[model samples]
Target: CPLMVKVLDAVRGSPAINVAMHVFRKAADDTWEPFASGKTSESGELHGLTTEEEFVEGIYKVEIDTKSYWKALGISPFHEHAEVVFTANDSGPRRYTIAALLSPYSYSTTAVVTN
Candidate 1:
């Protein structure tokens, strides 16, 4: 199975470069467990973070640290952090992609289920 995420800058209409990303899985008791972390590349993409683990069906959250990213660009971030929650279904496709579009002040995200 393959799991991935891509971040884009809505204002520039391109990938949000070098963003910090953290992945968390929700446990049975409703607590979040951090599983993986990395930084996006120049293309604003990160992959294989979830490949080493079982693709369990549950709620998963991707936390994007946007403050430093915007700071690097010489601007104050509209939000310090952006959190995206998605559900992984066992019956769904084995490959998954989450796309996050963000500006300094606002953001949006969606997941694409694929084989």
Candidate 2:
């Protein structure tokens, strides 16, 4: 199983391109550690991030750096970042997908386990 995330504009319902993103896993010491980082592609997708490691059951955070993104769109964001928190359980390895919808002032997300 693997992990992937997709980001989109909440108002437009379109892919969010070139957003700086970071994935963090809750370490054994209960500290947040950076696990992966990258910018969204033209399709607003981030893939192959966790392909190299085995999945661990714990909490995870996906942080999107939205300051520059909104700035480029000529909007002043109420917050500099947006974060989506999820968890990997004992359910075993499977394709995990997170879909995020964002706007300058609001956001939402969904986590799905797929084949």
| lDDT tens per residue, model 1, 21-75 | 8889998899999988888988999876865257667888889898888889887
lDDT of 2 by residue, 1-115 (tens): 3888888987666899998988899888999999788888989988877862556787989888887888988887887788887777557666788887888888777888875
Question: For model 1, what is the error of residue 70's alpha carbon versus the real structure, in angstroms, after optimal superposition?
Answer: 0.9
Q: How many residue pairs clash in each candidate?
A: 0, 0
Residue 105, model 2: lDDT of 86
- Among residues 3 or more apart in sequence or in different chains, the pairs in candidate 1 whose N, CA or C atoms overlap within 3 Å are none
